[PDB]
Design a protein around this ligand. Structure first.
Ligand code: HEM
Ligand SMILES: *[C@@H]1O[C@H](CO)[C@@H](O)[C@H](O)[C@H]1NC(C)=O
Ligand SMILES: *[C@@H]1O[C@H](CO)[C@@H](O)[C@H](O)[C@H]1NC(C)=O
Ligand SMILES: *[C@@H]1O[C@H](CO)[C@@H](O)[C@H](O)[C@H]1NC(C)=O
Ligand SMILES: [Ca+2]
Ligand SMILES: [Ca+2]
Length: 595
């Protein structure tokens, strides 16, 4: 079975045997083994890595090496022949807001992140890959099939650097290769406060004593705060509009500015943190800075947990929610709190829930301005459309009153992500999220679809007709088979996302299981979980399960009309109510009468 505890690139520094708030890094949540959950650890393996050479070469690296006796089809071919469509008409979800899609990506970003191998940006590494489409070491380029329009227009490939792997990063050569999770595995707002201690206090207002996060001093949203601007030049948010020179946002998470609505969701959360930390100096004026940061950090944490488990997961998982996430029976410190390698592919069902356009809505939820609807792809690394063109209230109104994309076996991923993705260093709106997600299953040595069906106790099809029956779809099945030649070779991402959806959910049985088990684990293995008796006082708890995303909007924007149930498809006048009609976070039980 072998390797016992390779624990290299980490400063070990041990634990603080009480510290009534979590570490920034996730360390010390588990007392038996303190690294469990922590960031800059290997993603857990639910099943063994599958590589060409059984060590680190991804399937389809060496042309004349099969997988179960067949070549693997090019990622981009799969993307083109299965994942593509033209007609955005009739593709939206009549019963899920755009908030449904946005929260997905919020929670996802809190849980897992496998950054690329740097290994030098003062090298051809970037050139030898993008420019010459040469496969080598960490350069794993997405080759185009023949008849591909990008042949005519871009080149022979689109760049792809393999994901960060533990012990070194300098090539390792003995046991199966394991990618890193650079955020804390715990639902702990790590995407707001950082997963490394350095960044964590950079994000903080140390200047004053009040316990705030650093807010923007260049620019404001009426009275209301923006995220601080991100140092690093080069900036991609600058690059897409050279004229506006509005750089990316600096959040706890580095993907914060990937698209306007996620930077938007980030901007609700900072505001809430500060809002919490004023109310506390209001009620507990003796409490110092640290105590106001951490005690606010603690509430926002529980807020993310409730919304997710109470509002989000029940409408992702549906019928299968109770089967996997039965009621809370308290902290089981034998539960693995870690994100699994497979879960970081399971959670990308989200990619099929992203619609082709984002609107900005006025106070009567009508086109704010003449350019109110925009193509998704203009909004990658787009920060200027926020500070120079209406703030967040009009984007939040969109989120509330526009709909998420329904996954459709025939219309999987909008060409806004499948042809027009911008990547932070490549200067063209010209990449393919879908082909990337497929190259990446291989990079991360993922087991085939059947292995994972196997894992969730579900049939393993070997035949076209066998596959028609599970996907409940003839032509989807024919194509998969024509490309993969066996269901054993189908990449977990696309495999999983081809299954019809479970009753009252937005994922299939295979995904429901993988996702179910993980949210089960991330709740049960968390020592700092909000419902874990002792973490919060019972009155604090009685206040907390009255919180609403509606409520989060009301206190952190100049928006006054909000739905009760912000994830269901909600129409203006009717399904919207006044903010006063909405339960608020009563922090009276936080009052410290130490005097
Ligand atoms: C642009 C992108 C999005 C929207 C415009 C978007 C949206 C989501 C949602 C809604 C998710 C979950 C419900 C979700 C999950 C994960 N994503 Fe994804 N996403 C966009 C773009 C990307 C890009 C680019 C990546 C990196 C792709 C790569 O493999 O190189 C990406 C990743 C993920 C991801 C894995 C994160 C990780 O562990 O590294 C999800 C769980 N998304 N996105
Ligand atoms: C710290 O808070 C003080 C008081 O509000 C304020 O003047 C200062 O801007 C804050 N610093 C930052 C960068 O948020
Ligand atoms: C860039 O921003 C400027 C204002 O800062 C705006 O007027 C212009 O239209 C923007 N250009 C693009 C391509 O978005
Ligand atoms: C705790 O989890 C471990 C490992 O998953 C399991 O063996 C055990 O039965 C669980 N105990 C309880 C009380 O849930
Ligand atoms: Ca795994
Ligand atoms: Ca986290």
């Amino acid at each position: 079975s072998w390797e016992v505890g390779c624990g290299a690139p980490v400063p070990l520094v041990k634990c603080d045997e009480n510290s009534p708030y979590r570490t920034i890094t996730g360390d010390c949540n588990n007392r038996r083994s303190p690294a469990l959950g922590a960031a800059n650890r290997a993603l857990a393996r639910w099943l063994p890595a599958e590589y060409e050479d059984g060590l680190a070469l991804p399937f389809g690296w060496t042309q004349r090496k099969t997988r179960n006796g067949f070549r693997v089809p090019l990622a981009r071919e799969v993307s083109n022949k299965i994942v593509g469509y033209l007609d955005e008409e009739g593709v939206l979800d009549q019963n899920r807001s755009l908030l449904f899609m946005q929260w997905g990506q919020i929670v996802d970003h809190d849980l897992d992140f496998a950054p690329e191998t740097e290994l030098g940006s003062n090298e051809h590494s970037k050139t030898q890959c993008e420019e010459y489409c040469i496969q080598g070491d960490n350069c794993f380029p997405i080759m185009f099939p023949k008849n591909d329009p990008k042949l005519k227009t871009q080149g022979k490939c689109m760049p792809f650097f393999r994901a960060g792997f533990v012990c070194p990063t300098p090539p390792y050569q003995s046991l199966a290769r394991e990618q890193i999770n650079a955020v804390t595995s715990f639902l702990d707002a790590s995407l707001v406060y950082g997963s490394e201690p350095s960044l964590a206090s950079r994000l903080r207002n140390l200047s004053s004593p009040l316990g705030l996060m650093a807010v923007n001093q260049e620019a404001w949203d009426h009275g209301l705060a923006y995220l601080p601007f991100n140092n690093k030049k080069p900036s991609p948010c600058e690059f897409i509009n050279t004229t506006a020179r509005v750089p990316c946002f600096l959040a706890g998470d580095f993907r914060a500015s990937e698209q306007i609505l996620l930077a938007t969701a980030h901007t609700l959360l900072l505001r809430e943190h500060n809002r919490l930390a004023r109310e506390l100096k209001k009620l507990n004026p003796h409490w110092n800075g640290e105590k106001l940061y951490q005690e606010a950090r603690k509430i926002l944490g529980a807020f993310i947990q409730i919304i997710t488990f109470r509002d989000y997961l029940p409408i992702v998982l549906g019928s299968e929610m109770q089967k996997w996430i039965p009621p809370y029976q308290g902290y089981n410190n034998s539960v693995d709190p870690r994100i699994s390698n497979v879960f970081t592919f399971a959670f990308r069902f989200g990619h099929m829930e992203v619609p082709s356009t984002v609107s900005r809505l006025d106070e009567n939820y009508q086109p704010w301005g003449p350019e109110a609807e925009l193509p998704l792809h203009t909004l990658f690394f787009n920060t200027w459309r926020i500070i120079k063109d209406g703030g967040i209230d009009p984007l939040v109104r969109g989120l509330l009153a526009k709909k998420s994309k329904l996954m459709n076996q025939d219309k999987m991923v909008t060409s806004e992500l499948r042809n027009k993705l911008f990547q932070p260093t490549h200067k063209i709106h010209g990449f393919d999220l879908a082909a990337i997600n497929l190259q990446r299953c291989r990079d991360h040595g993922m087991p085939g679809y059947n292995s994972w069906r196997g894992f969730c106790g579900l049939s393993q099809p070997k035949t076209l007709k066998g596959l028609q029956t599970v996907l409940k779809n003839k032509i989807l099945a024919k194509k998969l088979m024509d490309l993969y030649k066996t269901p054993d070779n189908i990449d977990i991402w696309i495999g999983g996302n081809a299954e019809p959806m479970v009753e009252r959910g937005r994922v299939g049985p295979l995904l429901a299981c993988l996702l179910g088990r993980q949210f089960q684990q991330i709740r049960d293995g968390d020592r700092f979980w909000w419902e874990n008796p002792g973490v919060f006082t019972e009155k604090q708890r009685d206040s907390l399960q009255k919180v609403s995303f509606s409520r989060l909007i009301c206190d952190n924007t100049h928006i006054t009309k909000v739905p009760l149930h912000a994830f269901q498809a909600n129409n203006y006048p009717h399904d919207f109510v006044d903010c006063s009609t909405v339960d608020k976070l009563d922090l009276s039980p936080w009052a410290s009468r130490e005097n």
